[PDB]
Amino acid sequence: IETVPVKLKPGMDGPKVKQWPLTEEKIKALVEICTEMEKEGKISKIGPENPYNTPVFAIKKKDSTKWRKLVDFRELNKRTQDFWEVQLGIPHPAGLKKKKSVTVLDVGDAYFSVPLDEDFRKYTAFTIPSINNETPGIRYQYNVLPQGWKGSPAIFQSSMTKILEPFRKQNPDIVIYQYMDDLYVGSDLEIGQHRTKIEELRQHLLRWGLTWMGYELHPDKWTVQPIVLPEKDSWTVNDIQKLVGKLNWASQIYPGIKVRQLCKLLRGTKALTEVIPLTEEAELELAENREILKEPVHGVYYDPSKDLIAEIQKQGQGQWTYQIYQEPFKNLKTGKYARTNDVKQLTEAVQKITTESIVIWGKTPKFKLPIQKETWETWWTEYWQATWIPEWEFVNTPPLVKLWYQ
C-alpha cells in the first residue's frame, strides 16, 4: 500500500527513553523474535545516527507459554497524539458498555502487512540489551506498523472497516470497537450464540491473513460499590467517631450527607469504650445518609477532553478497592478486585481496571499506584499480559482512605 505520512507535532521530538534492564531469559527470547522479524522484513538494523529509543520487554501472552514482544510506545504515543486522536481518531461507541457480553480478540498481526512511512521509521527505534554490557546491544527500527503504537490502528482503520463490512451488515446489533491491538465485540446474544458469532468473526479475519478476566466480559453485570456503613446492636464513642469520620469524608462526594445529630451524641470528653445508645433523631439521620449512599452521584459526568485517573487501595486479604475520576471526589466509577503476592495482584487489578476503562470510555487512565517505583519497575513484566501499557505514577497515599472504602 501507499504509506500514510505521519507528521510529529511541531516543537516535540521523538522519544529518548532508556531501556530498563532485562534478564537473560527475556533477552534470549527477544533475540530469537527479532531475528525472525528481520528475515520477514518487519524491522531492520539501524546505525548510531538514529538517536531515538523506546523500551522493549518480553511477556507471556495471556495464559500461554510462547514469549511475546511488547514495545512500550508511551512516549511516542504522547508525542503523536494529534495524528491518532484528532487527524485519524477512532470513535468510541457508548453501546459497548451496555451489551451482555463483550469478547476481546487480539488483531495485532494485522498491522505487520502495512508498511510504515519511511520518514517516521526512525522514531520507532529500540534496543535489545546485553548482560554486563558485554556487547553494545542490538538496535532496530520498524518497517511496518508496530504493535503498541496508537498510530497503527489509526492508519489501519480503513482496512479494518472493509474486513468487517460483511459481518456488520449481517449482524447490525453487534458492536465492534478497535482499541490498539485489540478488537472488542459486544452482543446481547445467548452466550452460545455469542461465541458462535465470534468464531464466525474469526473466519472473516482469517481470510485477510490473521490467525483477572474470564473468556468474555460482562459489562451489564457491572454496578457500583456503595460506600457502606456498619449496622450494629451496640455503639461505642469510637464506633461513632469512626462513623462520623467515614461519613465526613463521604460528604465531599455525596451532597446532603449530615452528621449534626451524630456529633451531639459525643458531647463531653468520653472514654472510647463507653457505649452510647442512639436517639431517634440520630438513627433517622443515619438512615437518611444510608439512602444517599446506595444511589448514584448527581452532577458528575465524563469529559472527553480530560485524562482519567485511577487510584487503588490495598485492603489486605487479597482485596483491592479502586476509584476512577477526572476531578477529585467526582468519581466516575468505583470498584473492588479480589484474589500470589502484592505485585502480581496489583498488576492484575491494573489490567482489569484498564480494560473496563477502554470499554466504558475508549481511554486508559493514569494510575496512582501504592508501591515503590523500583519494585514495580522490576516485577510488573513478570505477570503482565496486556498488549498495551497505561500511564502510571507512584504514591504514598495512606491512611483511612483505605478504611473509607471497604
Annotated binding-site positions for Mg(2+): 106, 181-182
Q: Output 173 or 281, the one with its CB closest to other proteins.
A: 281
**Cβ proximity of 361 and 310 under 8 Å:** no
Contacts for 83 with CB less than 8 Å, ≥ 6 apart: 6, 7, 151, 154
Query: Is residue 18 at the binding interface for other proteins, with CB under 8 A as the rule?
Result: yes
Nearest to 105 by CA among 61, 150, 67, 169: 61
Nearest to 355 by CA among 319, 386, 394: 386
Work out how close the CB of 395 gets to other proteins at its nearest, in angstroms, rounded to a whole number: 9
> What angle in degrees, to the nearest 10, is found between the helix axes of 151-170 and 191-206?
120
Q: Which stretch binds other proteins (CB under 8 A): 55-63, 67-75, 233-241, 385-393?
A: 233-241
Pattern of binders to other proteins over 247-286, x per CB under 8 A? -xx---------x---x--xxxxxxxx-------------
Q: Output 260 or 298, the one with its CB closest to other proteins.
A: 260
Q: Which stretch binds other proteins (CB under 8 A): 88-96, 135-143, 150-158, 170-178?
A: 135-143
Question: What is the size of the binding site for other proteins (CB under 8 A)?
Answer: 66
Query: Is residue 404 at the binding interface for other proteins, with CB under 8 A as the rule?
Result: no
Query: Is residue 171 at the binding interface for other proteins, with CB under 8 A as the rule?
Result: no
Nearest to 126 by CA among 9, 40, 34: 34
Instruction: List the 366-369 sheet strands across, edge first.
Output: 331-338, 319-325, 309-316, 366-369, 392-394
Q: Round to whole Å and give the CA distance between 25 and 27.
A: 6
Write out the binding residues for other proteins, residues 330-349 only, by CB under 8 A: 341-343, 345-346
Q: Round to whole Å and give the CA distance between 180 and 363.
A: 10
**Cβ proximity of 55 and 18 under 8 Å:** yes
Contacts for 133 with CB less than 8 Å, ≥ 6 apart: none
Query: Is residue 44 at the binding interface for other proteins, with CB under 8 A as the rule?
Result: no
**DSSP assigned state of 275:** B
Contacts for 376 with CB less than 8 Å, ≥ 6 apart: 343, 346, 369, 392, 394
Q: Which of 3, 87, 159, 378 touches other proteins (CB under 8 A)?
A: 378
Q: Which of 277, 299, 304, 398 touches other proteins (CB under 8 A)?
A: 398
- CB count, 10 Å around CB of 189? 18
Work out how close the CB of 308 gets to other proteins at its nearest, in angstroms, rounded to a whole number: 21
Query: Is residue 230 at the binding interface for other proteins, with CB under 8 A as the rule?
Result: no
Query: Is residue 223 at the binding interface for other proteins, with CB under 8 A as the rule?
Result: no
Q: Output 269 or 305, the one with its CB closest to other proteins.
A: 269
Which helix (H) or strand (E) covers residue 74, if one does? helix 74-79
Q: Output 91 or 398, the one with its CB closest to other proteins.
A: 398
Q: Residues forming the annotated binding site?
A: 106, 181-182
Q: Output 117 or 342, the one with its CB closest to other proteins.
A: 342
Q: Output 145 or 237, the one with its CB closest to other proteins.
A: 237
Work out how close the CB of 21 gets to other proteins at its nearest, in angstroms, rounded to a whole number: 5
Query: Is residue 313 at the binding interface for other proteins, with CB under 8 A as the rule?
Result: yes
CA distances 248 to 107, 189, 244, 278, Å, are 48, 44, 6, 18
Write out the binding residues for other proteins, residues 105-134 only, by CB under 8 A: 125, 129, 131-134
- CB count, 10 Å around CB of 357? 19
**Cβ proximity of 345 and 318 under 8 Å:** yes
Query: Is residue 21 at the binding interface for other proteins, with CB under 8 A as the rule?
Result: yes
Q: Which stretch binds other proteins (CB under 8 A): 50-58, 109-117, 208-216, 298-306?
A: 50-58
Q: Which residues bind other proteins (CB under 8 A)?
A: 16, 18-19, 21-25, 27, 47-51, 53, 125, 129, 131-137, 139, 236, 238, 241-242, 244-245, 248-249, 259, 263, 266-273, 313-314, 316, 341-343, 345-346, 369-372, 374-376, 378-379, 396-400, 402
